[PDB]
């Protein structure tokens, strides 16, 4: 189904299954009719792409997110977080986070009455939330080419549906599903990042 699995109670996420879950995610980019959302799309898979190899490599030991931090800020020191699955993990989770709210604002009925049929105004709150505060004025640039070549929700909710049969009310419905645990999971991920003095500001 590809929904997250659910938060445990004691907020360990484990890796392996959080990076099967995630790893549904990139594909749906593809769906869009562009060329325009390669970067955004290839940013994720490549730090989803990173994470694995990291835990890969022995996954009793990186068997949780924080399992990850714990041992990458040993086996580093002072060059930690800016390094490995940790630093990969900082990027995803902005990627994971654009999505979230994204979907959760499309969701919500927020739109451009001027608008209705685009998906601009969830976008770029979207960017705003996760992204923009870490993006200099090139890979801005980068980002709004995708902005406006948004697809129409029309037909985006139409690439969701792919599943299908299904009306654009029971398409938003199977949405807000997917963002309860997807939702809480980003968000102890960003928890974890601030209590580990794991998050970085730098732009790129
Ligand atoms: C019900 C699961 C829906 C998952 C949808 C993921 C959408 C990616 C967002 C985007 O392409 O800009
Ligand atoms: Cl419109």
Same mark, same amino acid.
């Given at each position: 189904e590809h929904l997250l699995r659910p938060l445990p109670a004691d907020k360990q996420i484990e890796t392996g299954p959080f990076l099967e879950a995630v790893s549904?995610?990139?594909? %749906? %980019?593809?769906?869009?009719?562009?060329?325009?959302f390669t970067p955004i799309k290839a940013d994720i898979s490549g730090n989803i792409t990173k994470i694995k190899a990291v835990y890969d490599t022995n996954p009793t030991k990186f068997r949780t997110l924080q399992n990850i931090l714990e041992v990458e800020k040993e086996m580093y020191g002072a060059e930690w977080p800016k390094v490995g699955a940790t630093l990969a993990l900082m990027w995803l989770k902005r990627g994971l986070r654009f999505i979230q709210v994204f979907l959760q604002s499309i969701c919500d009925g927020e739109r451009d009455e001027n608008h209705p049929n685009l998906i601009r105004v969830n976008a770029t709150k979207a960017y705003e939330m996760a992204l923009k505060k870490y993006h200099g004025w090139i890979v801005q640039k980068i980002f709004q080419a995708a902005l406006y070549a948004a697809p129409y929700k029309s037909d985006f909710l139409k690439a969701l549906s792919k599943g299908q049969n299904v009306t654009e009310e029971e398409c938003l419905e199977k949405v807000r599903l997917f963002l309860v645990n997807y939702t809480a999971t980003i968000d102890v991920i960003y928890e974890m990042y601030t209590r580990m003095n794991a998050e970085l500001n730098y732009k790129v």
């Open positions: 549904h995610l990139p594909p %749906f %980019f593809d769906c869009l009719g562009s060329p325009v």
